[PDB]
Amino acid sequence: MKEVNVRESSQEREQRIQQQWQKGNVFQQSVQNREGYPSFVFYEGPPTANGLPGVHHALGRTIKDVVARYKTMTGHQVIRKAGWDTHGLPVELGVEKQLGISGKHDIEAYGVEAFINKCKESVFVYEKQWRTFTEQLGYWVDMEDPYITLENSYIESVWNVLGTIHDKGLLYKGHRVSPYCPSCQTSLSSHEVAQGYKDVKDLTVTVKFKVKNRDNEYFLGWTTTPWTLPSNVALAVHEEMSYVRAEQGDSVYIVAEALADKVLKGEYSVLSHHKGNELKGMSYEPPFNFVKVEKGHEVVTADYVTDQSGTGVVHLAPAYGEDDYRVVKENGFSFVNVVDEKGQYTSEVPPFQGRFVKDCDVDIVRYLANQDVLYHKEKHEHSYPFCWRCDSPLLYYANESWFIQTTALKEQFLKNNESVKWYPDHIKHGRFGKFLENMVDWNISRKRYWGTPLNVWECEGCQHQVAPKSIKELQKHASHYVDDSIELHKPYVDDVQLTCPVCSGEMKRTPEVIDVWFDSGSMPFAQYHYPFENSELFQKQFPADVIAEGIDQTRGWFYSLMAVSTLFTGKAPYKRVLSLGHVLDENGQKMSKSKGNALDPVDLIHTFGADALRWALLADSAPWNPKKFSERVVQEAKSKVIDTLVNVYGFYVLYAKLDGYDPEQTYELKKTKLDEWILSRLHSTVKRATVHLEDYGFTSAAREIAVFIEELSNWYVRRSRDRFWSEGMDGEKAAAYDTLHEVLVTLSQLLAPFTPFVADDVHENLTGKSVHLADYPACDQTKVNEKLEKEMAAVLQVVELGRSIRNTHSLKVKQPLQSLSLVVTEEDVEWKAYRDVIKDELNVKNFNVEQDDDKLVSYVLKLDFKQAGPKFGKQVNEVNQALKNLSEEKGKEFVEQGKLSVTLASGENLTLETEDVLVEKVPKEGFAVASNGMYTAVLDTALTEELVQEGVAREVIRAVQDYRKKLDLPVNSRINLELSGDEEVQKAVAKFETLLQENLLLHSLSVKETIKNGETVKVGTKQVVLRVLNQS
Ligand SMILES: CC[C@H](C)[C@H](N)C(=O)NS(=O)(=O)NC[C@H]1O[C@@H](n2cnc3c(N)ncnc32)[C@H](O)[C@@H]1O
Ligand SMILES: [Zn+2]
Ligand SMILES: [Zn+2]
C-alpha cells in the first residue's frame, strides 16, 4: 500500500484515480469480465446537445451510474453506450439566436445547408461539454463510441422503423386541426403540448347574432376565443335541448331555456319554447362581414353543445377547433381560414391584417360594441397551451400533417405499461397512465430543416406513397443515381426523386422532418443500427431492464420509447422505470432559465469532489419528489462522510507501515468486544444496504452506510487508537489491524457504486485490485451479533446523556467526577461488560446501576393557585410557604399517601387535597440528572479538592506530553522534567506523583521555584513553566 501523507485535494485524488481508470481500461474491463454472466440491460437517455450541463443533470447520471455499477458488482454484465440527442426544435432555436435570425424565411435566406452546418457545429461543442462533465462525475458510459441521432446509421434505422410502421397503414397524412406554434411555425405533438400549459386570463364574450328574415330577433352566440369571430361559419345548438325566444326591451333574443335567467338580466319575458332541431337551418348575420362564406352562416346541430355554460348557441370557426371542423364538414359548409402560418390575420380581415390573433382580443371587443352586436364579456382563468421551446402561446390550427396512428394500438400501450414496474409506483397509473388513457394520434411532421427527414415519397401523378426503409431501398426506386454516401438530411434527400411503381410518375419526398422525440424513442433499435447490423447484440440488449430519467419524460422519452416500440414491435421496450424528481434552486426549477437557476457542476466537482456531490444527491433526500439542492449539503457530505473515510483510511495506512502489519502474514488475533461490535455493524450494514439497493432505495442505503461510517470513526477508531499507537505487535494490536483492514476493504466495496473515486482509492491501495472489478460484498451472518449491537447502542445513549449533563453544568470531561448512577427500568443490558467504557468516556470514578431513583431524588412541594387559590382564601400564601417549609420525608410521604395537612403559624392545621399541591422531583444535593425516558443518568457534580487536584494532575500530564511532541523527542527516552508553578499545582503534582510517573517516561521530575529559559504553558487558568533536560 502507498501513503496518504502528502496533502491531496479532492480534485487531485479524483484526477489521479481517473487516470488510473484510463490506463487500466477499468470501465471496459468491468464489462468484459462479466461476459457469460446474466445480462442487465440499461438504456442511456440521450441528453440534448443544446446547452451546458447543470447540477440538476447530475442527479440522473449519478443514479444511472449507481445502478450500473451495483448491478455489475452483483454478477451482471451491464453494457453502457452513451447517446446524444442532436435534432429538432431544441437545437434549431438555439442556433437561430446565435445567428441573429428567426423564422423559416430567414433560414432559407441564410441557406438550409449552411444553417444545418451551424447546427452540427453547435451540438458538437455541447457534446464535449457534456462528455467532460460526465467523466468527472464518474458516470461510466461509453462516450468514445456513442450513438448520435444525426449519424447516418442511426437515421437509417429510424427510417426502417418508420417504413415498417407505414407498411402497417399506421403512418398517414391528414388535414386536421392540431396544436400549432405560430412562432416555430409548425404543428406539435400531444406530449409536447402537455409540457407547456400555463394559467392565462382572457375574455369569453356573448355576441348578438341577428336573425335574417326577421326583425329585432338576435341569436345569443358564445365563444371563448373572440379572435375567431371573423371566421364564423355556423352556430351550433343541441337538437334535443330547449331554447326560448325571450323579449328584452326592444329586442328578442334566442337562448337556451336553462341559461336564460343567467344570460338575460334585469328584465325579460319568455315568449315561446323551441327545441334545437327546430332552430336548425335558421340564418343570421356575422358579427364581422370581412370574409365571405359561400355555404354557411346558419344554425346546425352538434351533440357536444352543453347547457351548463355559455348560451346553448356556440360560434363555430372550422379552422380553429376540432369540433368546429367536424361539424362544418358534416353539413357541407365552406372551410375558411383568415390566419397565416405566423399566427397573423390575412388580408381577408383588413383592420387587423398582419397582427397576431391573440393580441387582437382587446380591439375585437371594441369592434363588437361599435357594430351593435356585443352582449356580454367575462373573465376566464384557465390553462392554455404554450410552446414548450419558445414559450409562445399555441393555436389550434387546421393544417396538413403526418401522424403515427398510436390510437390503433392503444390497448397494446396499456398492456405494455401494465408490465412496467414504476418508481415511484404512482406514476404508472398517474402521470404516465392518465396520458395513455387520453391518447390521440402522434403528430410527427415538423415544417423545419434540422432533423430526421420523414422518409415518405408521394407520386405527383397518383399520390401513391413509398417509404424507403434503407439507403438501398432509396437507391432502388430513385429515378437518378443515388450515391452510397448520401446523407440522410435535408436538403440532400430533397434532391432524390423516385419513379412511381404504379404510374411511373415523379415521386417527391414530403418536405417535413420528424418530431425530435421520435429520434430518441427509436434508440433501442437505432443505437445498434438494427436490423442492418448487430442483430444478435440487439436481441441481447432488448428490452431494457431499467431506465432512469426525470419525470418530464412521462411526456417525453418514456412515452416516445413506449410508442415507437409498441408500433414497431408491439413489445414494451423497458421493464422498469425510475422517474426522477427535478432539482430546485431554493425555489425554482433548475434549467437553462433566464435566471439560470443551475450551478456549474464542474466547479462543484472541483471544489468538493464528485463523490461528495454524488453522496449529497443520493443521501440528502429521495429522488422521486422535487429536490431543493444546496452547495452546503455537498460541503457537509465532503466533511462528514468523504473526509471521514479518508482520515480513517489514512490512519490505517500510516500506522500499518510504522508497525509493519501485513494482511498476508498470519498473526495471533485477540479480537476485543469493540472489534466484534464494529464487525457486526459492518455486516448488518452490508445486509441492509443490499436490501435497499435491490429495491432501488439509494437514499436509505446511503443513510445506513453513513451511520456505520460515523460509528466507525467516532467510536471504533477513536476508542482503539491506543492499540494502533502501542509499541508491540501483540494479539490485541493485530486484532485491531485485522478488524480495520476488513472494515476498509468491505466498506469501500459497499461504497463503490455510490462514491466510485474514494472507494477505488482505498480498495486499490489496500488490495492491489480495482474495487469496480470486484464483487459486491456478502453479509457474513456469523459475524452479526444482534445482542452486542443492542447493548452498545444503549451504552452510546448513556454516554450521550452523561455528556449532556457535563455540558449543562460546565463540567469539562477532563475533570473527573465521583460517580454516575444509571436508573434502568428493566435489567435488559449486561451493564457490567461496559462499565470500563462508561467510566472512561464520562470520566467517573464509579458507575452504579439502580432499579429506581429513590436514593437519588427528593421532593419539594408548592401550591396550585389555579386549583386551591379560592379554597384557602387569604391563607393561600401562608399555605404555599408552609408546603415549601416541609422536610424531605414530608414531601416523599405526600407523593405516597396523596393526602397532606399543613400547620400554619397560627397553629391552625389545614388539609391539602392531592390536586392542591404541585409536586416537583429534584435530584439529591450535588447531583444532576438527564433522562431520555428509557435510561435516567444521575451525575455527581460535587467537586472535592482531591478531584480538582487529580484534574490538575491530568492537565499537567497532557501539557508535558504535548511539549514532548513539540521538541521532536524520541518516543522512548526518559527525560528530566523541570516544572514551575504555584502551590496549587505543586500540591497536585506531589499528591499524584505516581499517576504522573505512570503516564510520563520521566527519569526525574523537579519542582523548581523559577526556571531559566523555560517554556510557559497553560494548565487550566494557571501558567506552568516546563523544561526538559535530556538525561546523560
Ligand atoms: C431522456 C432525454 C430526452 C430524450 C431529451 N434529450 C432530454 O430531455 N434531454 S435533457 O438533456 O434536457 N435532459 C437530461 C436529463 O435530465 C433530466 N432533467 C431535466 N431537467 C431536470 C431538472 N431540473 N432536475 C432534474 N433532472 C432534470 C431530464 O429529465 C433527463 O433525464
Ligand atoms: Zn414555438
Ligand atoms: Zn404514381
XYZ file of C-alpha atoms in Angstrom, residues 96-328:
233
model
C -31.098 30.806 -34.717
C -30.345 33.122 -31.789
C -26.594 32.642 -32.296
C -27.047 33.711 -35.930
C -29.422 36.585 -35.194
C -32.125 35.099 -37.438
C -35.667 33.878 -36.809
C -38.364 32.119 -38.821
C -38.382 29.865 -41.855
C -37.825 32.734 -44.310
C -34.634 33.825 -42.532
C -33.281 30.259 -42.507
C -33.992 29.771 -46.216
C -32.341 33.115 -46.976
C -29.408 32.032 -44.800
C -29.258 28.739 -46.696
C -30.563 25.387 -45.484
C -27.218 23.584 -45.747
C -25.306 26.464 -44.140
C -27.818 26.614 -41.278
C -27.632 22.841 -40.783
C -23.831 23.015 -40.689
C -24.206 25.532 -37.858
C -26.452 23.039 -36.039
C -23.870 20.263 -36.438
C -21.117 22.516 -35.092
C -23.178 23.629 -32.088
C -24.179 20.117 -30.997
C -20.546 19.005 -31.304
C -19.463 21.749 -28.887
C -22.077 20.732 -26.312
C -21.299 17.010 -26.625
C -17.735 17.700 -25.485
C -19.005 19.851 -22.606
C -21.380 17.062 -21.575
C -18.682 14.410 -22.026
C -16.239 16.253 -19.748
C -18.999 16.714 -17.160
C -19.927 13.023 -17.334
C -16.342 11.783 -16.967
C -15.614 13.975 -13.945
C -18.906 12.938 -12.336
C -17.723 9.336 -12.616
C -20.734 8.177 -14.650
C -19.222 5.315 -16.653
C -20.835 5.347 -20.093
C -19.166 4.817 -23.468
C -18.774 8.304 -24.929
C -15.898 7.247 -27.203
C -18.370 5.249 -29.338
C -21.769 6.796 -28.570
C -24.930 6.711 -30.609
C -25.754 10.102 -32.126
C -29.147 10.858 -33.654
C -27.580 12.834 -36.517
C -25.433 9.900 -37.687
C -26.452 8.275 -40.964
C -26.621 4.762 -39.484
C -28.890 5.936 -36.655
C -31.219 7.782 -39.047
C -31.340 4.759 -41.353
C -32.681 2.604 -38.516
C -35.222 5.354 -37.808
C -36.209 5.188 -41.486
C -36.597 1.408 -41.237
C -38.902 1.794 -38.229
C -40.952 4.482 -39.980
C -41.172 2.402 -43.152
C -42.272 -0.661 -41.193
C -44.945 1.419 -39.457
C -46.035 2.721 -42.867
C -46.336 -0.869 -44.149
C -48.926 -1.436 -41.404
C -51.001 1.564 -42.505
C -50.245 3.427 -39.267
C -48.377 6.358 -40.876
C -50.826 8.638 -42.666
C -51.169 12.210 -43.859
C -54.273 14.171 -42.950
C -55.712 17.671 -42.809
C -56.676 18.086 -39.148
C -56.980 20.792 -36.507
C -53.811 20.449 -34.448
C -51.955 22.341 -31.719
C -49.753 24.793 -33.574
C -46.952 27.165 -32.609
C -47.181 30.431 -34.602
C -43.567 31.335 -33.761
C -41.903 27.997 -34.553
C -44.453 27.730 -37.417
C -45.128 24.014 -37.042
C -47.684 21.687 -35.519
C -46.819 19.976 -32.232
C -47.421 16.554 -30.710
C -49.768 15.792 -27.820
C -46.922 15.083 -25.375
C -45.153 18.341 -26.296
C -48.358 20.290 -25.627
C -48.771 18.597 -22.232
C -45.413 20.132 -21.207
C -46.358 23.759 -21.889
C -49.560 24.651 -20.035
C -49.809 27.961 -18.175
C -52.626 29.793 -16.409
C -53.961 32.654 -18.540
C -56.706 35.250 -18.096
C -58.617 36.146 -21.270
C -62.157 37.159 -22.232
C -65.102 34.975 -23.236
C -67.842 37.008 -24.903
C -71.520 36.707 -25.797
C -72.418 38.290 -29.137
C -75.783 39.104 -30.689
C -76.309 37.244 -33.986
C -79.231 38.963 -35.703
C -81.548 36.510 -37.445
C -82.202 37.013 -41.145
C -85.756 37.427 -42.486
C -86.718 38.692 -39.019
C -86.745 41.956 -37.073
C -85.378 42.598 -33.549
C -84.502 38.853 -33.322
C -80.868 38.211 -32.328
C -79.197 34.902 -31.566
C -77.011 34.921 -28.451
C -73.804 33.204 -29.522
C -70.949 32.440 -27.149
C -67.229 31.936 -27.719
C -64.110 31.678 -25.575
C -61.889 32.927 -28.430
C -63.148 36.292 -29.726
C -60.424 36.452 -32.393
C -62.116 33.564 -34.252
C -65.320 35.586 -34.743
C -64.342 36.976 -38.208
C -64.127 33.344 -39.397
C -67.623 32.405 -38.202
C -69.366 29.851 -40.415
C -72.157 28.396 -38.278
C -73.916 28.377 -34.912
C -74.232 25.095 -33.017
C -77.227 24.026 -30.919
C -78.197 20.719 -29.337
C -81.177 19.292 -31.209
C -82.824 17.898 -28.052
C -82.103 20.952 -25.884
C -84.754 23.536 -25.041
C -84.368 27.118 -26.263
C -86.531 30.186 -25.646
C -87.364 33.302 -27.639
C -87.349 35.908 -24.864
C -88.018 39.606 -25.411
C -85.888 42.128 -23.525
C -86.528 45.824 -24.001
C -86.956 46.421 -27.730
C -85.254 43.180 -28.821
C -85.991 39.450 -28.741
C -83.134 37.036 -28.039
C -82.879 33.287 -28.667
C -81.120 31.494 -25.806
C -81.172 28.134 -24.047
C -84.048 27.727 -21.598
C -81.878 26.665 -18.653
C -79.463 29.583 -19.183
C -81.951 32.381 -19.934
C -82.162 33.666 -16.354
C -78.355 33.970 -16.258
C -77.713 35.472 -19.707
C -80.719 37.837 -19.592
C -80.586 40.080 -16.517
C -82.810 42.885 -15.300
C -85.956 42.271 -17.327
C -87.151 39.704 -19.858
C -90.288 37.857 -20.937
C -90.235 34.353 -22.420
C -92.480 34.155 -25.496
C -92.068 30.675 -26.983
C -90.205 27.422 -26.382
C -88.195 25.738 -29.134
C -86.132 22.578 -29.414
C -82.725 22.545 -31.055
C -83.814 20.789 -34.246
C -86.455 23.492 -34.779
C -83.799 26.233 -34.858
C -81.763 24.180 -37.344
C -81.462 25.958 -40.686
C -82.089 29.498 -39.426
C -79.732 32.045 -40.990
C -78.146 35.123 -39.425
C -75.659 37.960 -39.943
C -71.998 37.546 -38.961
C -70.542 39.958 -36.397
C -67.807 40.579 -38.985
C -68.517 40.520 -42.727
C -64.847 40.882 -43.714
C -64.815 37.329 -45.101
C -67.430 35.590 -47.239
C -68.798 32.092 -46.603
C -70.387 30.557 -49.689
C -72.289 27.932 -47.666
C -72.574 28.974 -44.041
C -73.882 31.495 -41.529
C -76.682 29.147 -40.472
C -77.633 27.098 -37.398
C -76.667 23.417 -37.197
C -76.983 20.548 -34.721
C -73.983 19.404 -32.666
C -74.240 16.786 -29.931
C -71.491 18.285 -27.735
C -73.406 21.525 -27.056
C -73.817 21.804 -23.284
C -76.393 23.811 -21.342
C -74.120 24.109 -18.292
C -72.061 27.004 -19.692
C -72.488 29.712 -22.297
C -75.842 30.190 -24.009
C -76.516 26.890 -25.796
C -75.566 28.563 -29.096
C -71.882 28.195 -29.955
C -69.963 30.073 -32.636
C -68.127 27.652 -34.955
C -64.966 28.514 -36.887
C -63.900 25.261 -38.619
C -60.214 26.187 -38.982
C -59.542 26.795 -35.270
C -61.396 23.996 -33.467
C -61.553 20.238 -33.970
C -65.268 20.131 -33.135
C -65.893 23.133 -35.392
C -64.016 21.440 -38.239
C -66.048 18.239 -37.874
C -69.494 19.862 -37.698
C -68.782 22.253 -40.584
